[PDB]
């Protein structure tokens, strides 16, 4: 139960799952901790050790602001970090099947959180059910978020930008050099993540230094062409210097600002991160991926459009009600505690919150496209409209356009539409199939009947886990043995996609066709 890696021995622990055993190695370090001189730098290789590292508990989460908008509410607190925050957080986790497999496919998980939050130690990210049920090895890693992971002064190796993407990339290399010792096949590595984690997975498809570190990709509710995912390199510099003044760290030697920011206390940087943008939205990515000239050599949209990415199979998908979660973090007349029926003027107020820097005409064009009704006095007309707007603009339409663009360079792609509202979902029912609430199905939590899910949820999670596993091993997300719906390839022309629900599973075409022609062709011009 001790494994010898390239930097020394590590001790794990075994776990009982479904009357079998999984071996967990929680908290293997994969880089020299990025403190002091190393804060804001790319991660550095990890010096050998001759003891036995004890990988028996999750390591520290990375520094980050907590969501304190619904204290005590499980719906928001289940996403808050559940281990000590620290700048010493570059660690990873590995769940291997027991008995040790011999050439197992490796699934590498990248959590979301808008590039400002998240941690690999969340309960819904527990890879033990996947290791037990599909006999894959599951790896997740922590990576720097917010200013600590994405502060950008282009070219300056003191704060080059994209450091958190490089933490991810060094985790992938760790798996390349070391996963053979755990019984895994480095030649069969599938990346999957959700939200900002999905956008990260898509950026690894573009970054040449990641080409050789993984085989396939799975993108849940996210991609790099979402409007919140990448920021221009000049908007990045404006933000790092606005943080510089806010901490009184202003200089004309850019390098001297960095070493000034290197002496400030993480809490001081965290509490100023929010204000480096002129007007915030509940979707703001204050510090995030940029075109840095190293991880990312051009605007991702050019690279996607011109076929400059890793050629491979992708699995891409979204939830029915991506946008609702954000409405109760700032939209007036909205609350998780009533059913949030809003008015036409409340709707228009909501647009100013989510599209603050957008012209009067832009906002009416949004209102005009979403507010001519199949019936004008459904009292929830404007409430549903505002949720669709946020979800279609921020998630569904970027994921559809990514998939279109990706598949027209010849690779197989599969698109799902997740529309089961979980029975354990703590938010009110008007919020529907919320952002992030497919993750528990992917990780196979409903497989554990000890814990509150209907039998129908267990069965739906059982096939999702099988399709995901079959996609990782074989490049094809079919459930073959149980007479399931066949998942058609998503072609650029007909655009078939698969719906995922408890009743049964249907092939449909051209998800949100009218809404996406608005968002992806009209609205970019305004
Ligand atoms: C004005 N406010 C409101 C509050 N917030 C601060 C922190 N944020 C996180 C909050 C807001 C968002 C997401 N829920 C988690 C969640 C809640 C409920 C269900 C499922 C998930 C909490 S975030 O980490 O900045 C960020 C995150 C996710 C993102 C996804 C896409 C794009 C950007 C994102 C940004 C900004 C200031
Ligand atoms: C680029 O940065 C300037 C400077 O930023 C601001 O100062 C920070 C400390 C923080 O308080 C931000 O909210 C400020 O915006 C921005 O310039 C300003 O515009 C805002 C409102 O638009 C105004 O409050 C400030 O007085 C302006 N500051 C100056 C120095 O004139 C600017 O908006 C940023 N954005 C872009 C796109 O360049
Ligand atoms: C739904 O609730 C929102 C606000 O949630 C509430 O906040 C307090 C007002 C309190 O009543 C809590 O118990 C509620 O759950 C309501 O929005 C408020 O409306 C008033 C109207 O005078 C306005 O002044 C406030 O700013 C609003 N609060 C906001 C925008 O956060 C809303 O009216 C409720 N609607 C329904 C149909 O129940
Ligand atoms: C590492 O841990 C050793 C203890 O072994 C076991 O660790 C966990 C799983 C506990 O359940 C404990 O009862 C076990 O015996 C220590 O002997 C060793 O000193 C530790 N090393 C370091 C560096 O802390
Ligand atoms: C694992 O599979 C690869 C091909 O996918 C092969 O080249 C390698 O030798 C295998 N290793 C084993 C079976 O230990
Ligand atoms: C000041 O800036 C120059 C580049 O213009 C740089 O070479 C120098 O190292 C900076 N000062 C310090 C103390 O590093
Ligand atoms: C197939 O169906 C059986 C029930 O007949 C179920 O127990 C099994 O787990 C299913 N397999 C998959 C991959 O869903």
UniProtKB/Swiss-Prot annotation:
One of its GO terms (cellular component) is endoplasmic reticulum lumen. Inhibited by mercury. Inhibited by Tabun. Tabun forms a covalent adduct with Ser-195 that becomes irreversible upon aging. This is Cholinesterase. The active site is at residues 195, 322, 435. Belongs to the type-B carboxylesterase/lipase family. It is linked to Butyrylcholinesterase deficiency: An autosomal recessive metabolic condition characterized by increased sensitivity to certain anesthetic drugs, including the muscle relaxants succinylcholine or mivacurium. BCHED results in slower hydrolysis of these drugs and, consequently, a prolonged neuromuscular block, leading to apnea. The duration of the prolonged apnea varies significantly depending on the extent of the enzyme deficiency. Changing residue 30 to C: In BCHED; enzymatically inactive in the plasma. Gene3D superfamilies: alpha/beta hydrolase. Glycans are attached at residues 14, 54, 103, 238, 253, 338, 452, 478, 482-483. The modification Phosphoserine is found at residue 195. Detected in blood plasma (at protein level). Present in most cells except erythrocytes. It is an enzyme of class 3 (hydrolase). It comes from Homo sapiens. Homotetramer; disulfide-linked. Dimer of dimers. It is found in: Secreted. The lineage of its organism: Eukaryota, Metazoa, Chordata, Craniata, Vertebrata. Its main location: secreted.
